[PDB]
Scaffold this active site. Structure first.
Site, PDB file in Angstrom:
ATOM      1  N   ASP A 191       0.816  -1.207   0.000  1.00 32.87           N
ATOM      2  CA  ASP A 191       0.000   0.000   0.000  1.00 32.87           C
ATOM      3  C   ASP A 191       0.856   1.266   0.000  1.00 32.87           C
ATOM      4  O   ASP A 191       1.584   1.527   0.959  1.00 32.87           O
ATOM      5  CB  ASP A 191      -0.899  -0.034   1.241  1.00 32.87           C
TER       6      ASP A 191
ATOM      7  N   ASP B  78      -3.330   2.540  -5.627  1.00 34.01           N
ATOM      8  CA  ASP B  78      -2.334   2.365  -4.589  1.00 34.01           C
ATOM      9  C   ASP B  78      -2.163   1.070  -3.827  1.00 34.01           C
ATOM     10  O   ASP B  78      -1.389   1.026  -2.870  1.00 34.01           O
ATOM     11  CB  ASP B  78      -2.559   3.516  -3.600  1.00 34.01           C
ATOM     12  N   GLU B  79      -2.870   0.033  -4.247  1.00 36.28           N
ATOM     13  CA  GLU B  79      -2.824  -1.259  -3.571  1.00 36.28           C
ATOM     14  C   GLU B  79      -2.607  -2.467  -4.465  1.00 36.28           C
ATOM     15  O   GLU B  79      -3.085  -2.507  -5.598  1.00 36.28           O
ATOM     16  CB  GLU B  79      -4.141  -1.534  -2.857  1.00 36.28           C
TER      17      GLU B  79
END
Length: 232
Positions: A8, A100-101
């Site tokens: 993350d 973002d992950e």
């Protein structure tokens, strides 16, 4: 041994903006787009109670000294693809979620420490993009994502059967990934307020309140289980 790591990016949008504008480092930065709301609040801004989702005017009221920047999706797209390509190229099964992950699977020699895979991921990403990320480690997606919360910021964290209940036991059900606020209010109305209590609750209590399959899924989450297949 089969592991699951969840990566993350730390305050992603803000971080990308800081490349373009270095003078702002260490200061409250707020990115706003789509009435306009906060799309990313820097960690400094969050200290003033500012969070993603809230209207910009309400954000300005809480953090008068923050610097507001317009949202720039194309730059965020580009920045993310670079990172994702970097993750994919490590050779492990990979699953991207949003900008973002990512979840990635690693089948490792029973003695190999997974933390080393995580330290290489952090280094590669920082070296190539300037961005910091955090990495949660476990044997399923949900528990790994929960592990990520403890790794923030710029860290690594391992959650398994060994430390699961010690770390989670006394927390409210919503600390589990997959269990939201509405479900935890319903659970409170039935006298269930911690993960440890939920983990040993009789199946029938849960299945009549949430249906046959959801009742069982809540038990699995509370015991630290979850999805195990990453699949690219």
């Amino acid at each position: 041994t089969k592991w699951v790591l969840h990566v993350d990016l730390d305050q992603f949008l803000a971080s990308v903006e800081l490349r373009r504008r270095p003078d702002l480092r260490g200061q409250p930065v707020i990115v706003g787009g789509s009435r306009k709301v906060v799309t990313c609040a820097s960690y400094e801004a969050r200290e003033f109670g500012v969070h993603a989702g809230m209207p910009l005017r309400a954000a300005a009221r809480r953090c008068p000294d923050a610097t507001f920047l317009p949202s720039d999706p194309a730059a965020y797209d580009e920045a993310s693809e670079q990172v994702m390509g970097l993750l994919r190229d490590l050779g492990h099964p990979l699953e991207v979620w949003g900008w973002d992950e990512a979840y990635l699977g690693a089948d490792l020699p029973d003695e190999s420490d997974p933390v080393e895979v995580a330290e290489r991921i952090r280094t590669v990403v920082a070296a190539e993009t300037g961005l910091s990320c955090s990495v949660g480690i476990s044997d399923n997606k949900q528990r790994a994502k929960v592990a990520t919360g403890f790794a923030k910021p710029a860290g690594i964290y391992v959650l398994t059967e060994a430390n699961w209940m010690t770390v989670m036991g006394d927390r409210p059900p919503d600390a589990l990934w997959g269990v939201g606020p509405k479900t935890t209010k319903k659970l409170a109305a039935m006298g269930i307020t911690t993960v440890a209590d939920l983990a040993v609750t009789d199946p029938s209590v849960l299945t009549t309140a949430f249906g046959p399959s959801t009742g069982l899924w809540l038990l699995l989450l509370a015991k630290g289980g979850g999805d195990t297949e990453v699949s690219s």
